């Protein structure tokens, strides 16, 4: 008689991908689906799939897509999400690749704590005596750790890339028996660096 | 004081925007396709006095080639193809561009994520080489007489999304002109055939219905088609 023409999505992202930042708050509109039906039938938008349906809600008439629970780039970096549009005689579906975008939302975490090391007072200047280690799961500059002492010490230095502690001035057991240094591990995010503190105990032992 | 901080600058992104570099290409793209124009990493591999070292990590199956000096990434697919469809199933490639700052020894990994887009590079395929139905001559108009494309027994297509979903439409048959008039497919997505005109065993006992499956590619002239024949035999009574 007069056969139905099915609707089709028109969003550009179906041809490429959709980028959503991991800091996007629950409740935020993340996009708006767009469809054309030549009959101009009233259209109904939806999301399909168990995984997809818990992350995204879809307003049926307008097609706005909301985030229902928080994304986390550290847990899952991308999804393939299947959307649908239907005209009451038929449902069509199209997948979109969703790339989760990272923000620096993690400070470094130290490993092998507690840090404590015994050294003799005659340890030469330049001797590597200990290695500190922290890791940070954020991408790029936000996951590259730098080490420092806060404040810097006259008796010990720490290699900022490698976390190797060396002795930089002659030790005197009589003047000072133990040191309590604060190691800082920061990432290098440009606008929002994050950092963590850890203690380093250096106990001096005597020869005489 | 942070006086000598300028030396920590090399290996950081020169561009703004988020840390991952994301790009897309079509499947089956040719060897040497430029994946990334320019990584835009501060500093300088090569030249008279290089300030950084660039290399690729987690480059599984060596799909990516780096030019450290120009900071370009290329597709490496000589003697093979980048197939998104089964049985290769390559939907995305993730590699790390490692940048080691020479002066200070810091290491920053710049993640590259490549989204591989599906092309309609496969045609539909009928499970069987031909199809059949028997119908009683007293079968009334409007009855469904064939159902055999149900449940992946008809045409399927290994491509993704609409490139992989099928529409069946009856063709005119020059060797059996009335067959496309006696039978219709009202719902092209199912491919069920219904009787449109009264039958008569005394006048004609066999119809050769030609049915063409096409896939549903966005661009009508990218669509692909396959043809099969449904032979309908009348039974008596
Ligand atoms: Ca319609
Ligand atoms: Ca996170
Ligand atoms: Ca993060
Ligand atoms: Ca971080
Ligand atoms: Ca392919
Ligand atoms: Ca394909
Ligand atoms: Ca196809």
Curated annotation (Swiss-Prot), chain A:
Glycans are attached at residues 133, 184. Residues 12-110, 111-206 form the Cadherin domain. It is found in: Cell membrane. It comes from the Eukaryota. In adult animals relatively high levels of expression are found in testis, skeletal muscle, heart, eye and thymus, and lower expression in kidney, lung and brain. Found in the sensory hair cells of the inner ear. Three calcium ions are usually bound at the interface of each cadherin domain and rigidify the connections, imparting a strong curvature to the full-length ectodomain. Cadherin repeats 1 and 2 mediate calcium-dependent heterophilic interaction with PCDH15. Cadherins are calcium-dependent cell adhesion proteins. They preferentially interact with themselves in a homophilic manner in connecting cells. CDH23 is required for establishing and/or maintaining the proper organization of the stereocilia bundle of hair cells in the cochlea and the vestibule during late embryonic/early postnatal development. It is part of the functional network formed by USH1C, USH1G, CDH23 and MYO7A that mediates mechanotransduction in cochlear hair cells. Required for normal hearing. It is linked to Defects in Cdh23 are the cause of waltzer (v) phenotype. Waltzer mice are characterized by deafness and vestibular dysfunction due to degeneration of the neuroepithelium within the inner ear. Interacts with USH1C and USH1G. antiparallel heterodimer with PCDH15. Isoform C1: Interacts with CAMSAP3; leading to inhibit CAMSAP3 ability to induce microtubule bundle formation. This is Cadherin-23. It comes from Mus musculus. The chain holds residues 24 to 228 of 3354 of the full protein.
Curated annotation (Swiss-Prot), chain B:
Changing residue 22 to A: Strongly reduced interaction with CDH23. It is linked to Defects in Pcdh15 are the cause of the Ames waltzer (av) phenotype. It is characterized by deafness and a balance disorder, associated with the degeneration of inner ear neuroepithelia. It comes from Mus musculus. Disulfide bonds join 11-99. It comes from the Eukaryota. Glycans are attached at residues 31, 76, 180. Antiparallel heterodimer with CDH23. Found in a complex with TMIE and LHFPL5. Interacts with LHFPL5/TMHS; this interaction is required for efficient localization to hair bundles. Interacts with MYO7A. Interacts with USH1G; this interaction may recruit USH1G to the plasma membrane. Interacts with TOMT. Isoforms CD1 and CD3 interact with TMC1 (via N-terminus) and TMC2 (via N-terminus). Interacts with PIEZO1. It is found in: Cell membrane. Calcium-dependent cell-adhesion protein. Required for inner ear neuroepithelial cell elaboration and cochlear function. Probably involved in the maintenance of normal retinal function. Cadherin repeats 1 and 2 mediate calcium-dependent heterophilic interaction with CDH23. Residues 19-126, 127-233 form the Cadherin domain. Expressed in brain and sensory epithelium of the developing inner ear. Expressed in the retina, in the photoreceptor inner segments, the outer plexiform layer, the inner nuclei layer and the ganglion cell layer and, more diffusely in the inner plexiform layer (at protein level). Not detected in the retinal pigment epithelium (at protein level). Expressed in the spleen, dorsal root ganglion, dorsal aspect of neural tube, floor plate and ependymal cells adjacent to the neural canal. This is Protocadherin-15.
């Amino acid at each position: 008689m007069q056969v139905n023409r099915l609707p089709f999505f028109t969003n550009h992202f179906f041809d490429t991908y959709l980028l959503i930042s991991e800091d996007t708050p629950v409740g935020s509109s993340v996009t708006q689906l767009l469809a054309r039906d030549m009959d101009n039938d009233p259209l109904v938008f939806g999301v399909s799939g168990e995984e997809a349906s818990r992350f995204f809600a879809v307003e049926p008439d307008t097609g706005v897509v909301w985030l229902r629970q928080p994304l986390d780039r550290e847990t899952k970096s991308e999804f393939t999400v299947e959307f649908s549009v239907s005209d009451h005689q038929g449902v069509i579906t199209r997948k979109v690749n969703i790339q989760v975008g990272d923000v620096n939302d993690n400070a470094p975490t130290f490993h092998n704590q507690p840090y404590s090391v015994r050294i003799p007072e005659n340890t030469p200047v330049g001797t590597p005596i200990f290695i500190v280690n922290a890791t940070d799961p954020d991408l790029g500059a936000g996951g590259s750790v730098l080490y420092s002492f806060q404040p810097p010490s006259p008796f010990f230095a720490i290699d900022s890339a490698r976390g190797i502690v060396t002795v930089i001035q002659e030790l005197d057991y009589e003047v000072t028996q133990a040191y309590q240094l604060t190691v800082n591990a920061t990432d290098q995010d440009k606008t929002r660096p994050l950092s963590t503190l850890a203690n380093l105990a250096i106990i001096i032992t005597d020869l005489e | 004081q942070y006086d000598d901080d300028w030396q920590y600058e090399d290996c950081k992104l020169a561009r703004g925007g988020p840390p991952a570099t994301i790009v897309a290409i079509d499947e089956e793209s040719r060897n040497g396709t430029i994946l990334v124009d320019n990584m835009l990493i501060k500093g300088t591999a090569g030249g008279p006095d290089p300030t950084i070292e660039l290399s690729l990590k987690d480059n599984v199956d060596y799909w990516v080639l780096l030019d450290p000096v120009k900071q370009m990434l290329f597709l490496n697919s000589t003697g093979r193809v980048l197939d998104r469809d089964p049985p290769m199933n390559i939907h995305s490639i993730v590699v790390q561009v490692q940048c080691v700052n020479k002066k200070v020894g810091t290491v920053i990994y710049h993640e590259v994520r490549i989204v591989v887009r599906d092309r309609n590079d496969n045609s539909p395929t009928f499970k069987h080489e031909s199809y059949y139905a028997t119908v009683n001559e007293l079968t009334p108009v409007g009855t469904t007489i064939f159902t055999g494309f149900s449940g992946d027994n008809g045409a399927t297509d290994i491509d993704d999304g609409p490139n992989g979903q099928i529409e069946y439409v009856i063709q005119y048959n020059p060797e059996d002109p009335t067959s496309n008039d006696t039978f219709e497919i009202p719902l092209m997505l199912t491919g069920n055939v219904v009787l449109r005109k009264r039958l008569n065993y005394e006048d004609k006992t066999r119809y050769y219905v030609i049915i063409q499956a096409n896939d549903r590619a966005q661009n009508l002239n990218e669509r692909r088609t396959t043809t099969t024949t449904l032979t309908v035999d009348l039974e008596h009574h």
